[model samples]
Target chain A: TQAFWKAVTAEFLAMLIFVLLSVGSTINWGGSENPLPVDMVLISLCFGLSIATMVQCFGHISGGHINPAVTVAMVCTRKISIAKSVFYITAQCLGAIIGAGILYLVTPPSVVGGLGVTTVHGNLTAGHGLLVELIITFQLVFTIFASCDSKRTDVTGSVALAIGFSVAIGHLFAINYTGASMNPARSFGPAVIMGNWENHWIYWVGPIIGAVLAGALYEYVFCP
Target chain B: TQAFWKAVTAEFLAMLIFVLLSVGSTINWGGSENPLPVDMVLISLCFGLSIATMVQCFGHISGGHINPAVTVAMVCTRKISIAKSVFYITAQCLGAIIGAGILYLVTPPSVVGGLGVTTVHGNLTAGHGLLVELIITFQLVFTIFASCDSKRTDVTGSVALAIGFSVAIGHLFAINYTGASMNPARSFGPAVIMGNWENHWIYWVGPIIGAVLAGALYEYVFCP
Candidate 1:
């Protein structure tokens, strides 16, 4: 249970800081009703680099799934047991919630905007929201699996970096239309902070569904 | 001698791809003269992640001094022999020049706004340009010196990742006002292609002066 406790803390601390920085970055510092293109780019880099750094920091203890969707999919692939997955997911959510309070305190209320909640843009329906979420997570989780897979012997550079850039690319492409929730925990905390659950379920269903397919496909079909 | 040749090849090809991707990214794909904030962010990531990727590819082969400014510092500190530094710098410059040619061919001329040329904004004078270039590279070069120092056994995560983010931070801060160069080789290639040598000397002067100081400071003062 020593290692178990460590992994839970790893996920907890990781998600806590992750939520704080990334969700905090989503604020409209200029207080615009619409997010500027600069916001999209800056938010994308912050989210991207934080995860990459977090993976490097504690990835050996946990799988570095700071997001609940990854943990849920880890169980589906039977890589992590059901009970263990529950601990990881719960810790991540609670950690993110704890991190959420800091934003409410730090950001001036007028400029706080949505507290970085993942929501569909007015132009899109919830269906478009879900589809984009699913596709982006599909790309991110698949990259994660391939980058970290132990079976591979010929990978180049840092696997940690490969996974992070995958997330950045997803954010860059989807920030305008989709809220770009590649992970449910990333979206979940912001939703709670903003009190905006409208279509929040898309974050979970889309990312976890895509993640399961990513995990199963890579482990079963792709890996040699 | 064979190893020397190998290092030259490493730098050549690394800068080749680095210039291609990064300078090409500077294109005003929308052909907007005003330079949108979205353009700033996208170009920043492209430049950031591209160097991060390039360093991992060739860093082990060479010192991964993809920028001539870095090589200049290596020479000033006598870490690299002056003769060897010349080869590295020449190869890097030539490689970037060759790489710059591709953007001319591949990108539609209609949208090919400056081929990633680095220049000061109209809001600032050439002097502001020199100062920002100096500070940004001062920080970036300092990061590289400490990150690659063998004496420090406690470095976390990838040194390459650390160095690359240092470059990204420089871009995030300086892109609007000073062109975020941090590298003479990077700016030189684009300047040559554009035939716009207006204030081009700052790229060479600012980065090299800062690099020399960073090298001496880290190797002498910071290491013990």
Candidate 2:
């Protein structure tokens, strides 16, 4: 349907907007001020509201997968074809990288501050960072399963809200430990250019373990 | 179908979990070791995630009335049966009590010091509290009606996300006054256990007024 294409476009655009606005909010803004807690909340809310608006704007066409993890989860659940899921995930990652690149260019040097890189071992040890990431991603992926099941579509759209709050909450604790990189792509973009590989492997390993475990749990225990 | 019963049971159980998790996060756990700002974010996230999780778990059967204000607003809008709404509200209130009761039991004596009671005239006057509640509830109930309408079912399930985000965003600002009690049942449980009725009337009155006003506005002005 024509609507599906529009929805796909909307999903891409929404994902782009989320990456741009959210990272932009974290920028220092020329000695004006560093990112405050309220600014964090506002950025999280913008990400959430953008998803809501996009769903409202294009849910009829394509199922929204602003995050690649979400797309992969949907595919694992047999809710979408593997081929379609691949495309969606690719689109999402591309959107994220492009969004980050655009922010990198537009933002002032003083404000950019490495473009919101995800770091671990800031305060805690490498093991602690991995453990924290595992816990945060576990919570995140668990909520995703609950919020995006098609059989449960009536309640699934709340993924936008749950995912947003999860990100914010992850920051609440993980910021103190690992800078809160629940999404691999979220960590990927900033790390690519900055070349700061300090414990970067934990972000990928932790979230992957968490996501796969959650997917297995929901499939074998809860849904089964 | 037996599924309806399962759905309603899920609602009851989820409400209990919702209240418990939300209040538990606010408890000054780990003594002075817990970060206040981070803890608050956790508490707020618990509330939002509870809604997201419950809606997915039970939205099929009961429409998931985890909050009294939600039940009342649905009733006022004639979106649900009055008897059903009453039952839901009662269950919600009971869930809140049980939730608070359990939290009181588990938390250390001094840590449970305040139990997160809602109060008025601390930072916001009664009128301001009422106004804030109205705005929050208006966004919540409006999202409910808009998302779940039969004609809009194709687009409505996404509403759970909108409603949950609205709640978090509301607390982002409204927590300063009335502790951001948009749900009467949320207020009732803590107040009953704490045995402090100071400004309790505002909790009940403000939420009821807000819910009804939201219902009316969405029906007459926004939706119509």
Candidate 3:
């Protein structure tokens, strides 16, 4: 019971810190919707570093998922029980909401633009965004499986930063054009604060689909 | 003799793979000078993934540094001896040269374009580029120390991907600006291929200084 509560609590804190730091980075300080090249550098680092640091902090405890997509994959792989996953997802979403909530009030009124809401940044269609999200999340989940594979002795590396950099590389690939959201929880927090749900389903469905496929492949085809 | 040569051999292969795959991403179809923003995405991924892969592949053999800076830090920290460091550095440089040589002959001359040479771009002065290289390399070496300290149980992660993502984040931050040479061997390989030596010292000095400070601080202060 104690371990269970601690695990869920770790998930809550990781997601809170993740959203608070990463979503907060989307602010360009002048109500700018489009990030300049330099802005992109900052956004990418914050996103990556926040995830890395959190994973480093909470990884051994709650599995350091900080993403519903990752949680779903774990559930499908039976790495975690369905009952625990229900709570884990609930904690993550709630943690994200509060994370975004804090940023909403703390942000200066003069430059409170969308509070880092996720959307298709350029002219990309929602379907296009969906594919991008799916691909990026697929990479993240697959890398996690590889990085954390208990059976693989060749993995001289740990899982936390590998997982984080997977997220960072995905952002480097998709942040500029498609406004990457490899984690539904990452997108959910900011959206709630802003109440902007334009094409919101892409973040949810895309990452879930990607994560499920990665889990299945790793568990059945590749590692099996 | 067998053990010593294995380490050198590992370095050679690691550097070769790092150069060929990482630099190959820079060839933007038919010898383009400037890459599209889209192209930066791939370059970032290739360099990051290449470094991580080499580390995962050869980490146990020679520490899988695949970089002069990392080996230099190991020397500074006294993790490895002077004789071994010299051999490792030589092997890495030699391997990178051979690696670039392979890319040179295999690559079509129609798009040889410096064989993935790194240089300061656009309006930045040489001094500005030096700072970028130093700062980026500093972040990397610092993260490397944090990731690999044998004493700290908190480091629960391995050194490979943490170091790899540090490189990735650095590239994502400055790939377009300073050309992001976190490792001298990375630049050395292509430099020999192209006979390009303009502003080359920055890669060496900046990374060395960065590595020195990181090694000293971490060994003497942070984890000491």
Candidate 4:
């Protein structure tokens, strides 16, 4: 269990850094009257590249499942132990909260609107938002399995990078609909900090359902 | 000779697809009233992921130097033959033009503003724009060398993905300044299609200078 704690620490720190960068990127540094300094494309990359950078830093220590959906998917696929998944998920949520809190503290209050909370926008129904989240998470989880599969001996250190792109692509298509929250921890941390729980259920339910399906499908059908 | 032609073909097709996706993603489907459906983050990922996807598809066939800057860098670093570099660069430029033309045909004329041309924005002078392009391209090409270096035995199939992130990150910071045209071919195609040659020389001169400097620095200093 020393190793287990190390793994837990890796997951925690990775999640913290990921959330910090991801949410921090969304802050409108230029104030309310001015346009956002960074656009959706830049924000999406911050999320993706934050994951890529963190995974590169901590993947060997804990497999870099910085998101709860990712950890749950690994459990469903029997790639990791149930106990470890539980611990990792817990650590990830905690890390996300701390990360968001840190960003909130650092950012001026005027520029920190919504704290990057995931919400259904425009005419998107909650069910439609759920579906969008599911599909995007499916893409992300499936890519994760493909990138990390040992049977695919060709893939190397770039697994983190591919997973990062998966996250970016999910946002590229889905950000307008559901704020593209494929990770429960990613959505949860900000909600917890900002006390905005509207449509929060979709983030958890959609990603979990999608991730489990992706994990099962990849492990049993695609890889096998 | 057959192998040479195959490599050229790979580079051409990759650049074509890269430019198509990158420029295609920029076209605002909605008219001027509504904000663009996709933002800079989405556009950045399209370019980066386009490269990642194409490199994965054709990396083995050629070196997958989809950009003239990349081809030039590889030649400067002695990674590819000068003969192959010339062919690859030519193929890439031609592919870019074809790709931009295809997007122009598909997109509405009103929404296809400038066809995604690289231009100096804000208070940025032409010289400042050139400097920004140089810095961002330096970041990208340096990353390319680091990701693909043979001595870095640990890196694997994800080299393409890492390179893609480099592109994404470059855009994340520089899009507001120079439109972040790290690749000369990327800027060239759109300029040709749109007839907007405003400060076009900056794209070629800045990226080539940056790429060559990055290649020499990485090859001589970092690896050596």
Off by over 4 Å in 1: A1-158, A163-224, B28-35, B122-125
User: Considering only chain A, what is the TM-score of each predicted structure?
Assistant: 0.92, 0.78, 0.92, 0.93
Listed in order, each prediction's TM-score against the native is: 0.55, 0.55, 0.57, 0.57
The sequence of per-residue lDDT tens digits that candidate 2 reaches over residues A87-176 is 666666666677777888886566446576778734555665576567556656666666665465434354545655555544543453
**Comparing to the true complex, what docking class would candidate 3 get?**
incorrect
> How do the residues B1-224 of candidate 2 rate in per-residue lDDT, one tens digit apiece?
45444545545655665565555545533244434464456456656655655565455546765677778878877876876667677777887888677656544354355665766635656687667766676666666666665654255345556666666776766776667777777778888888887778777776777777777876888667
Write down the worst ten-residue block by lDDT for model 1 chain A: A28-37
* Stretches > 4 Å off in candidate 4: A28-33, A36-38, B1-44, B47-224
lDDT (10s digit) by residue, model 1, range A6-107 = 899988889888878787777644465553456656777788888889999878879787777788777786788988888898889888877877766787
Looking at model 1, give its docking quality level.
Answer: incorrect
Chain B TM-scores across candidates: 0.93, 0.86, 0.92, 0.92
Q: Write the per-residue lDDT of candidate 1 for residues B41-143, one digit (tens) a residue.
A: 6877767766776665456657788787888888777788978888899899988888777545544443256777687764677776788888878888888
Q: Judged by lDDT against the true structure, how good is candidate 3? A: 0.73
Clash pairs (backbone) in predicted model 4: A40-B41, A41-B40, A41-B41, A41-B42, A42-B41
Measured against the true two-chain complex, the DockQ scores of the candidates, in the order shown, are 0.07, 0.16, 0.09, 0.12
Using TM-score as the yardstick, the better of models 2 and 3 is: 3
Q: Candidate 3 on A1-224: residue-level lDDT in tens?
A: 88799999999988987887887777744354443344544666678778879989988898876789999999999878888888898889988989878877777673365676777654556665576677567767877876676765455455666666666556654564347788888788878777788888888998999899877765774444
Rank the candidate models, highest DockQ first: 2, 4, 3, 1
- What candidate 2 keeps of the native contacts, as a fraction, is 0.29
- lDDT at B116, model 3: 71
Candidate 2 achieves a global lDDT of 0.62
